Amino acid sequence: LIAAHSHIRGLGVDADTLEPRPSSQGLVGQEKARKAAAVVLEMIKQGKIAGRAVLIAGPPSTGKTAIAMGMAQSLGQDVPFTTLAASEIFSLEMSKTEALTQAFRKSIGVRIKEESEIMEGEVVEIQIDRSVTGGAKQGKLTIKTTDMEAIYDMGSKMIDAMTKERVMAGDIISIDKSSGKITKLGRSYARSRDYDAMGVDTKFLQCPEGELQKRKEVVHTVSLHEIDVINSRTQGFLALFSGDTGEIRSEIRDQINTKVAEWKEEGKAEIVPGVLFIDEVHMLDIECFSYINRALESDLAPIVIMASNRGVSRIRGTDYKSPHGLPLDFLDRVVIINTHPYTPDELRQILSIRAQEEEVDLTPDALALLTKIGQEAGLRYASNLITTSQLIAAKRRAKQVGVEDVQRSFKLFYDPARSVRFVQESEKRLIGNDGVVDF
Amino acid sequence: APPIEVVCDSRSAVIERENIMFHPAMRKALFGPTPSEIKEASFGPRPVTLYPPRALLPAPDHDKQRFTNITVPSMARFVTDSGKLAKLDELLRELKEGGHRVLLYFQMTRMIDLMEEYLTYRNYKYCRLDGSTKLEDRRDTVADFQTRPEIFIF
Amino acid sequence: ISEVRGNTRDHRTAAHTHIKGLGLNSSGIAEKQAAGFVGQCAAREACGVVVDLIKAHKMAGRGVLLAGGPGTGKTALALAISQELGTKIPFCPITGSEIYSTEVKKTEVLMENFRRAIGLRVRETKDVYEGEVTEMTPEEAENPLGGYGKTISTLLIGLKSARGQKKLRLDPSIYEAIQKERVQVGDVIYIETNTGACKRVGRSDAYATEFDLEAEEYVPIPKGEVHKKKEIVQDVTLHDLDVANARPQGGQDIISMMGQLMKPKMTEITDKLRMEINKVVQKYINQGVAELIPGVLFIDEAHMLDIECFTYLNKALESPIAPIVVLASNRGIATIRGADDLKAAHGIPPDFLQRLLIIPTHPYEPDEIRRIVRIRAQTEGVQLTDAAVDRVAEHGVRISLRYCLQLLAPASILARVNGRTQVDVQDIAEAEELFLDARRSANILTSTGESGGLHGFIS
Amino acid sequence: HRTAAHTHIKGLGLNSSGIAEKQAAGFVGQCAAREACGVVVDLIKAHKMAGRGVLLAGGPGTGKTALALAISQELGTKIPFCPITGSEIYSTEVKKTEVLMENFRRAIGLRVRETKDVYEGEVTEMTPEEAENPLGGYGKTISTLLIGLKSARGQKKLRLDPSIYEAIQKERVQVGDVIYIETNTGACKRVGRSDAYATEFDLEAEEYVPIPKGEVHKKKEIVQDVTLHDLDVANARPQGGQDIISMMGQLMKPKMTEITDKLRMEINKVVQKYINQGVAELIPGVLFIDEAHMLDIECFTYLNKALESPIAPIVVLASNRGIATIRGADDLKAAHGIPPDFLQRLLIIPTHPYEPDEIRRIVRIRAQTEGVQLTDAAVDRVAEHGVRISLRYCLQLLAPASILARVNGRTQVDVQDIAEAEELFLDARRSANILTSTGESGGLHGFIS
Amino acid sequence: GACKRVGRSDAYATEFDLEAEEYVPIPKGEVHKKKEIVQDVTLHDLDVANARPQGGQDIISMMGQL
Amino acid sequence: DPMMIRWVNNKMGSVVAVPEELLGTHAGVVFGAGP
Numbered sequence A: 001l002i003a004a005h006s007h008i009r010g011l012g013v014d015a016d017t018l019e020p021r022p023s024s025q026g027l028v029g030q031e032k033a034r035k036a037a038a039v040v041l042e043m044i045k046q047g048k049i050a051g052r053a054v055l056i057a058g059p060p061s062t063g064k065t066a067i068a069m070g071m072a073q074s075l076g077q078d079v080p081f082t083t084l085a086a087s088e089i090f091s092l093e094m095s096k097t098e099a100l101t102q103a104f105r106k107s108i109g110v111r112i113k114e115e116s117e118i119m120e121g122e123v124v125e126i127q128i129d130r131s132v133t134g135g136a137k138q139g140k141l142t143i144k145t146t147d148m149e150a151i152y153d154m155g156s157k158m159i160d161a162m163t164k165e166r167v168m169a170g171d172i173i174s175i176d177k178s179s180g181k182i183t184k185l186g187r188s189y190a191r192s193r194d195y196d197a198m199g200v201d202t203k204f205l206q207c208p209e210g211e212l213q214k215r216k217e218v219v220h221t222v223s224l225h226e227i228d229v230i231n232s233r234t235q236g237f238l239a240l241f242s243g244d245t246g247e248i249r250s251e252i253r254d255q256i257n258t259k260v261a262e263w264k265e266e267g268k269a270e271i272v273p274g275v276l277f278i279d280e281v282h283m284l285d286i287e288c289f290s291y292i293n294r295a296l297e298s299d300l301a302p303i304v305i306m307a308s309n310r311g312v313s314r315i316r317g318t319d320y321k322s323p324h325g326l327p328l329d330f331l332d333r334v335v336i337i338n339t340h341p342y343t344p345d346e347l348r349q350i351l352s353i354r355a356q357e358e359e360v361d362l363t364p365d366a367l368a369l370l371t372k373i374g375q376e377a378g379l380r381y382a383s384n385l386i387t388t389s390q391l392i393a394a395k396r397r398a399k400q401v402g403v404e405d406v407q408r409s410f411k412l413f414y415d416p417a418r419s420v421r422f423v424q425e426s427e428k429r430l431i432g433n434d435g436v437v438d439f
Numbered sequence B: 001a002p003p004i005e006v007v008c009d010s011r012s013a014v015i016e017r018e019n020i021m022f023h024p025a026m027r028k029a030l031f032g033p034t035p036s037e038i039k040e041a042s043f044g045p046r047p048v049t050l051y052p053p054r055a056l057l058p059a060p061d062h063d064k065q066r067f068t069n070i071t072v073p074s075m076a077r078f079v080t081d082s083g084k085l086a087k088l089d090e091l092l093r094e095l096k097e098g099g100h101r102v103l104l105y106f107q108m109t110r111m112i113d114l115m116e117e118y119l120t121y122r123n124y125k126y127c128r129l130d131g132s133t134k135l136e137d138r139r140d141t142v143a144d145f146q147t148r149p150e151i152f153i154f
Numbered sequence C: 001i002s003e004v005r006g007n008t009r010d011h012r013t014a015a016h017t018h019i020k021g022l023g024l025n026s027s028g029i030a031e032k033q034a035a036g037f038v039g040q041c042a043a044r045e046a047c048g049v050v051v052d053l054i055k056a057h058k059m060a061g062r063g064v065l066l067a068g069g070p071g072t073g074k075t076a077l078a079l080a081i082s083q084e085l086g087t088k089i090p091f092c093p094i095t096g097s098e099i100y101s102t103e104v105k106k107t108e109v110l111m112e113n114f115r116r117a118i119g120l121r122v123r124e125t126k127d128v129y130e131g132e133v134t135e136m137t138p139e140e141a142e143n144p145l146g147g148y149g150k151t152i153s154t155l156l157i158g159l160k161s162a163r164g165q166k167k168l169r170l171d172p173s174i175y176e177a178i179q180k181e182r183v184q185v186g187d188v189i190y191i192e193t194n195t196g197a198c199k200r201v202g203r204s205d206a207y208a209t210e211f212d213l214e215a216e217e218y219v220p221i222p223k224g225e226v227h228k229k230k231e232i233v234q235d236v237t238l239h240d241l242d243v244a245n246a247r248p249q250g251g252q253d254i255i256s257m258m259g260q261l262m263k264p265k266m267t268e269i270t271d272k273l274r275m276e277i278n279k280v281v282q283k284y285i286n287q288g289v290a291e292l293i294p295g296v297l298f299i300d301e302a303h304m305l306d307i308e309c310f311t312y313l314n315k316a317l318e319s320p321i322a323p324i325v326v327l328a329s330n331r332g333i334a335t336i337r338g339a340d341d342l343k344a345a346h347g348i349p350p351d352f353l354q355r356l357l358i359i360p361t362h363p364y365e366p367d368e369i370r371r372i373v374r375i376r377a378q379t380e381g382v383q384l385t386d387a388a389v390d391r392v393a394e395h396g397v398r399i400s401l402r403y404c405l406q407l408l409a410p411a412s413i414l415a416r417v418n419g420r421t422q423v424d425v426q427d428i429a430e431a432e433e434l435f436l437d438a439r440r441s442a443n444i445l446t447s448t449g450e451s452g453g454l455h456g457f458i459s
Numbered sequence D: 001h002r003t004a005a006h007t008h009i010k011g012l013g014l015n016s017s018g019i020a021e022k023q024a025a026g027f028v029g030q031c032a033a034r035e036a037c038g039v040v041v042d043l044i045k046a047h048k049m050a051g052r053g054v055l056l057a058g059g060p061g062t063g064k065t066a067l068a069l070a071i072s073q074e075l076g077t078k079i080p081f082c083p084i085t086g087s088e089i090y091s092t093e094v095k096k097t098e099v100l101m102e103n104f105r106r107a108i109g110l111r112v113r114e115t116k117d118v119y120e121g122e123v124t125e126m127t128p129e130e131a132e133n134p135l136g137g138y139g140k141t142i143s144t145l146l147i148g149l150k151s152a153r154g155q156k157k158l159r160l161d162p163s164i165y166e167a168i169q170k171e172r173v174q175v176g177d178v179i180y181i182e183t184n185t186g187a188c189k190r191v192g193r194s195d196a197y198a199t200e201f202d203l204e205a206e207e208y209v210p211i212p213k214g215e216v217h218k219k220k221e222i223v224q225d226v227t228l229h230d231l232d233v234a235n236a237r238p239q240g241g242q243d244i245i246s247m248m249g250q251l252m253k254p255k256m257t258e259i260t261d262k263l264r265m266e267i268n269k270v271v272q273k274y275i276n277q278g279v280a281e282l283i284p285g286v287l288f289i290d291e292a293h294m295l296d297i298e299c300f301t302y303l304n305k306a307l308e309s310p311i312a313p314i315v316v317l318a319s320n321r322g323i324a325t326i327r328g329a330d331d332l333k334a335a336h337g338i339p340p341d342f343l344q345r346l347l348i349i350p351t352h353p354y355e356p357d358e359i360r361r362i363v364r365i366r367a368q369t370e371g372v373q374l375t376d377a378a379v380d381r382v383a384e385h386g387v388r389i390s391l392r393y394c395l396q397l398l399a400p401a402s403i404l405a406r407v408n409g410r411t412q413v414d415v416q417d418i419a420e421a422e423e424l425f426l427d428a429r430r431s432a433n434i435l436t437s438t439g440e441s442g443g444l445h446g447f448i449s
Numbered sequence E: 001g002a003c004k005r006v007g008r009s010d011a012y013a014t015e016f017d018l019e020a021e022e023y024v025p026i027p028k029g030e031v032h033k034k035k036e037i038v039q040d041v042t043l044h045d046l047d048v049a050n051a052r053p054q055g056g057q058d059i060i061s062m063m064g065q066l
Numbered sequence F: 001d002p003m004m005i006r007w008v009n010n011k012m013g014s015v016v017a018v019p020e021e022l023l024g025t026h027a028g029v030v031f032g033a034g035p
């Protein structure tokens, strides 16, 4: 569907000069922060430099998450990109520091390569020997391509997969020999006229040619957190999905770091360093910063990019204030990129992009009035007015939206600048910090 | 480590240890039925139940190393710890797929051994002749290689 | 067994019983005194626009605030939206004081309620053979295998439903079902099509007297078809998919037979699981099998969420698959619960408040309280004279709205105890002194309750 | 091959007489701290240590943890070094004093010789022999086996307990599987089908290995590096043997528990029994607690009794705080956050700020470490930023200025690239100035105060 | 209905020579001793014994964690 | 073959063989042997 960051298709800079284009790939209307984020993106794609800190500071509704999603769309589905929010760390299951350690180790991909052995061909006969009331199984599978005619054997798991798949005579199946999955591709004969509970006639494929035992080289990418969970527990796997991981001791991490270094040297694995994005870091207390400053000290730390909103705020868990709510022993390590509020000739084209994304057609008078509203209430009210005016124009059966639809939507739904006045007018029928009356 | 036990010097302590720390009801319930019980339940005239109706051990979720901690080197790291061996692997795969038959010569019989392994892993048929190989055995081996084309490397 | 009572099948009167919908025109303009509401024009028009946004499937993570004082109709508009959307679109009305748990972090119950608010409709087919077994007769093969005894090529089963019976030829590898499940003559089974392994439901009811004491469940004959080719619509919320992938329901071992045997614990769900489920649901939509239907997460009393929750709500609303979030706040300048620093409007932080389409809610006129009294009175069935309506409206204007809607039940009780059928002025003037409001209670509390003594309150 | 923040540090760079020579092996200057760290290192490598307190004071950005990595690369690989923080010990399963003691016993190592007794054979005949089983509910029970192992030189035909049979049975050992019964626990890992049953027409993807050469009853010695905390975890949650506590104890989820005083004393007596047999060697180590001011008073209370032990590693505390308030009780202020009673144990090492030429040397070393070559005017510009703004701000203006240099086709970094990267990427001070100046009033284009 | 094996009697002591039992003498009293005991139970012990299985057949409690 | 029941499925049809030693047992009640 159409979320609030679906129009963005990357960061929109040059590849040779990385100059900020004034209108390219959604992120339209800002030049300094997009150029600096392009430099950060290039030193992430280099992968050499480890353990930095980028702080995208600025007023709200200025496109900070938009720049973050622009870097996310620009890396593709290769490099990990954790979209961590700062309130998720405060768990009750695990400690507050170990949640940060997992959040760092989720953003270091390990890309390994392994050889599987796939089969191909037409099943000629199945032969299954079963015991009575519990016991082992025996299996002989005769399979034929256009060239070879093999009679393979089977174990218990292969028969448990065959009966799960219901592989009859005359099926084009492909068995991965290593993993042990069975995917029926279709049939070569037709459906028999002797049995009732047979099934559905599948796709008509011919007999495959070539060889039986073919080899394949697959590439598997796991984060370090998955390696930590599968090597921290004897039988309790799958806890890396259902979040049941209590604590991983340090003896496990100091062995997995060494084994990943050995896999890096052997040419088995490759370390792909990633991005940890922390949205609204001002909610973390000082007990988190006293670990974040020291986890950025090793070869396995991701390049942290994080946002903020606040001016001189007080740091949680303390008694004193600081710029951005972050301590001044942590603000030495970071590098702060500022963002600026917008200009109306940029708000016009941003609302034009948001209107063309949600498939809404406009008139220039309505767009001028909409820009006039967006000057005084931000983009977050104007985009909602776009969608609302689309549906009100759909209610009265109009092709394009007009001035009257925007005025209707402005009359119905208040911007916060009028809701503050609505609070400040009737203070006697709203619960403040005190009592309230009823007429 | 094994779990801590109690050194109490009565017979009852030993009986309670072998009835709690081992407790054969749970072991029978976990691993499954005795094959004698399977025979008396599957040759009888009427169907009868089993107190472990199937093996209630959970399936381990890691195929190569289940329920232990005892690992061993990996022929993988073997074939890559030697640059020659790594390059021989590529070449033997291509040779095999071509239907070529190889004499493969070494200056060290210790290496002949290491390799012998590797060939077992990649499951190629081979013979061996070295200075340890007795004379009529020599005749025999060479004759094989020459009689029976299944053998890929000598 | 269970004896059926032939009584009256009535219903109970809640506080929002009379609400039956928004009551709009065909153009969106509200109309007063329609479908339960009285007045409140602009709020009902805006909620109609919200309902249109929900049914148009263009909402993908919006947010709607309901301001206004207590006792003015925010929850009434919420139930009006929930009854306007219907039943086949989800609606999860949590409160603010329901995210605080003791098994998980409080920024996780929010995400599970998002997943409760999203529905998924799946249309599939069901092909089963069905009914009571009459025969299990084998058939000898044409070419028996040498070295063995019997060699059976096709196994015949006669299945008899409650409408018609049918002979069935089957592949012989149904035997492993029949020996393991102990299927005999007179046991209803179902045979599926994708695998074909029959599973016994139970002994039929016609054979419930061949023996005397040997009893189990005696299920009846399947009163339906013998060859179901029936299609099924199936509604699963994404919360159910998260739970069934995180904690599997039915396993065959010891420890998963202790997991369903011990108490189910809410556990936090890693984000890779949710990302994978979204990536696969968005694939099955593109195949054209499953329909995504977003719903409403009406978080009532939104000023109980502290500042650690709105930070997670910003992330959760920026997701590409999210329902609408209809908040409900009835505070003015309030201190946010988490950070005791900033006094913000509505209890909402100023960063989060920009996302919200703020719908106002105004107090009621002193000639609309009596119309609400008339509608509430004809809802409960309590009928009453016009001077009684004017007195209840007097108490409604001068004291409260929720208090004049609660002088109808004791007045009706005293009316049908005194010996009448309708409520007069005397019954309300008598019931106004058995049930004091908050105002006269505070007057007694301050005036008579002077200080802490013997016959005094405990301040 | 990733240049972290601490890559150029390769040691303290000391002379033979223990005198720190400046600009050697990564450091620049900092004499009185590196000589004291060399004294600490030779205090570690002499084993007359049962708990000594070494504090590393000094402001932020002066290289407190650079000395810690220098110590950890000066001790070597075979000496334990446990670095933690002050925020790491606030757990949710155990009390934090348990986490302190677990780190203290992570920081003590032991080197043990062991003699494993493998039975490495190929299974020939596997036949169970059940015993009498009267009416007791569970039914029959296998009590004796006759597994025949077949090595290359001399087979053997041995008889087993029920428990080692269950160890076999949870490994799915058929006839033909080579195994290696470990007669220390009882464990037995199947290796694969023997090559006498080899067939290329196969589907199970088994690993075919040849018959194990040598005697079937081998006996081999190895050397193992085990800390005392590993022994604590081993005796606490048992995961060895073939009984029920040590089998149902590896299907549950693992939880950190509170290893009490009695186990921590009994394992000390067991290790002393190992040392008296001439087998094991004890090697004590370092607990480096960075950011010690985050520890509250309930931890500095327990460090007294944790250091009074006859076996306790040397503690190295780091604390970049001046006169500050202790986290536990908010009514006594002290230097560094350390309480005034615990501070007397510590041998306090100061750390002094830098100079406008030492910053130039550190910038030059960091540039030739990362791989960014540049000109001397650019080095003077970065040193000017280092004097004015911060030390670890001007080091971070080299990584964009390389990339921007590669934008303009250059190789070395000139004045223009740093003059552009000082405008794209800002520090904290000018950002706070822009914050205070522009953020005048809260509203639409303001900041949330 | 509570039973305890005290040991092996000393008349069958030297049957073999290094058996491992606790050889105790035959009791030089009655075989049927009849005594009466007054004994108290608190209701909380009834509550605990009716809620959860206690002590006797509660063998899964040797794990300890949950 | 003692206690194992064979199932073979070819292009013509699919049949199930039962060993003679199991026809007297309770396993042959489905196959039409029985006790």
Ligand SMILES: Nc1ncnc2c1ncn2[C@@H]1O[C@H](COP(=O)(O)OP(=O)(O)O)[C@@H](O)[C@H]1O
Binding pocket: A004, A005, A026, A027, A028, A029, A030, A059, A060, A061, A062, A063, A064, A065, A066, A067, A350, A379, A380
């Ligand atoms: N430069 C921009 N280009 C495109 N869209 C933008 C830009 N700036 C803001 N927006 C839109 O405005 C909305 C607010 O941006 P966001 O980053 O969420 O603000 P904040 O940083 O305050 O959270 C986003 O939905 C985004 O689509």
Ligand SMILES: Nc1ncnc2c1ncn2[C@@H]1O[C@H](COP(=O)(O)OP(=O)(O)O)[C@@H](O)[C@H]1O
Binding pocket: C015, C016, C036, C037, C038, C039, C040, C068, C069, C070, C071, C072, C073, C074, C075, C076, C330, C372, C401, C402
């Ligand atoms: N427009 C209306 N028409 C009829 N009844 C109303 C209307 N608005 C409010 N009510 C009644 O007022 C009562 C209290 O309103 P309520 O929904 O509790 O206010 P809030 O939403 O602030 O909690 C409800 O029982 C509802 O029946």
Ligand SMILES: Nc1ncnc2c1ncn2[C@@H]1O[C@H](COP(=O)(O)OP(=O)(O)O)[C@@H](O)[C@H]1O
Binding pocket: D005, D006, D026, D027, D028, D029, D030, D059, D060, D061, D062, D063, D064, D065, D066, D067, D320, D362, D391, D392
């Ligand atoms: N003597 C030195 N030589 C080289 N670099 C130094 C020296 N002292 C400090 N640094 C640099 O200072 C940076 C931060 O030092 P660090 O120890 O983290 O400061 P703190 O003492 O505040 O923890 C490191 O990247 C390191 O390169």
